[PDB]
């Protein structure tokens, strides 16, 4: 379905969480 | 412990389909995938380079060009230290829209942000619609540096990022 | 405000977020 | 490294306290702010039972209807499910029967289930007496507890009891 369901705030919050996790992951990955 | 001496925040903006994600994929992973996967909102990739004996970590944010993501993407303009404005040499509309992307920079980025225009897909010259001369003249008019690039053929991708980082660093060092 | 983004758009980011969290927790605990 | 991995799921209406119940279990903390869950999230906590290390992968579902398709995907692999209502919200309690039907349609027929009547610290807004929760759980043949993420009541007990019941079933291999 191409049907709009989720708001700007909802998608933005999950994107922000994803990007913050990617940074945390890259950091601890290079501690090796 | 800190793996760098400078951290530069870079941003890629421009119409959907011009090659921003492919330019970053070529720079960060030295590869090219022709299968188009439109960017959802924003993403970033990392590469660290060396300038004047200093370790420069580049944190490169890749924006979606589609209008439905515009508010999400413009939130990332203020922190950018350098911005690549990308068009597609085979898509005249994408070139025409560079003027509007510059306006978006003026409205939302820091006044002193470093800028560079990339005419991407310069490997596809038999479907070229924007002459290199026209790209150079537009960039000259705005006082912005210009390069034609190809993510596919790996033309000027390292040159574009190295040059933008050197311009950021020189400004930082002189102040 | 208004619904704007599709199920697939939100799901894709959610699943990327979940995957990075799992990867992060793994490298974290591997520092024993 | 662990001996067993138990996938748990929290379901129930928006606002009943699923995320705060998980926050109490995994961080021993509570906050009064409402940050509604976008689709689904999870936390991990590893516990020790009978000399076995049990890794609990706890999936925290959004209760709002617009996330229904996202959340029901996670029923299929669940080994235990907490059904949560808000003792101050009788509508959330009446909806437990609909959440049970959702389990019956998408989870294993033998999945471990437990009902939590949460926010039992808010007696000055209570709408569902404890006895009604006990009777609902008895009728389905499942366990019941009143919990409070805020006052730290029965949260540890609920998760450890669910995990022990999953382990006991599994040990009957
Ligand atoms: N021939 C050629 N094709 C390219 C080049 N760069 C990108 N492409 C193709 O152009 C299409 C669009 O590329 P993307 O990098 O995904 O475009 P984008 O700017 O990131 O688009 P949005 O994320 O939607 O804003 C892709 O299918 C690529 O295969 C290039 O340098 N040469
Ligand atoms: N007084 C009291 N308040 C609680 C308790 N548990 C949760 N709350 C509050 O109730 C509100 C909802 O809690 P959440 O855990 O976010 O609700 P949820 O079930 O996860 O809601 P969704 O994510 O939307 O499905 C928040 O303001 C919490 O602080 C409790 O045990 N006692
Ligand atoms: Mg892209
Ligand atoms: Mg929640």
Author numbering:
A (entry chain C): 128 to 159
B (entry chain B): 2 to 176
C (entry chain D): 129 to 160
D (entry chain A): 4 to 176
What does the paper say about this structure?
Rab8a is one of several Rab GTPases that are substrates of leucine-rich repeat kinase 2 (LRRK2), a serine/threonine kinase that is linked to Parkinson's disease. Rab8a is phosphorylated at T72 (pT72) in its switch 2 helix and recruits the phospho-specific effector RILPL2, which subsequently regulates ciliogenesis.
Here, we describe the crystal structure of T72 phosphorylated Rab8a(GTP) in complex with a minimal phospho-Rab binding domain of RILPL2 at 1.8 Å resolution. Full-length RILPL2 complexes failed to crystallize, but the phospho-Rab binding domain of RILPL2 (residues 129–165) yielded crystals in complex with pRab8a. The N termini of the RILPL2 dimer (N129RL2-T134RL2) cross over in an extended conformation preceding the first α-helical turn, forming an X-shaped cap (X-cap) over the coiled coil. The X-cap facilitates interactions of both monomers of RILPL2 with a single phosphorylated switch 2 of pRab8a. The phosphate moiety from pT72 interacts with the guanidino group (NH1/NH2) of R132RL2 on both sides of the symmetric complex, with O/N distances between 2.5 and 2.9 Å. In addition to electrostatic contacts, the X-cap residue F133RL2 contributes to a complementary hydrophobic interface with F70R8 and I73R8 from switch 2. Mutation of K149RL2—which forms a salt bridge with D44R8 (switch 1)—also abolishes the interaction between RILPL2 and pRab8a.
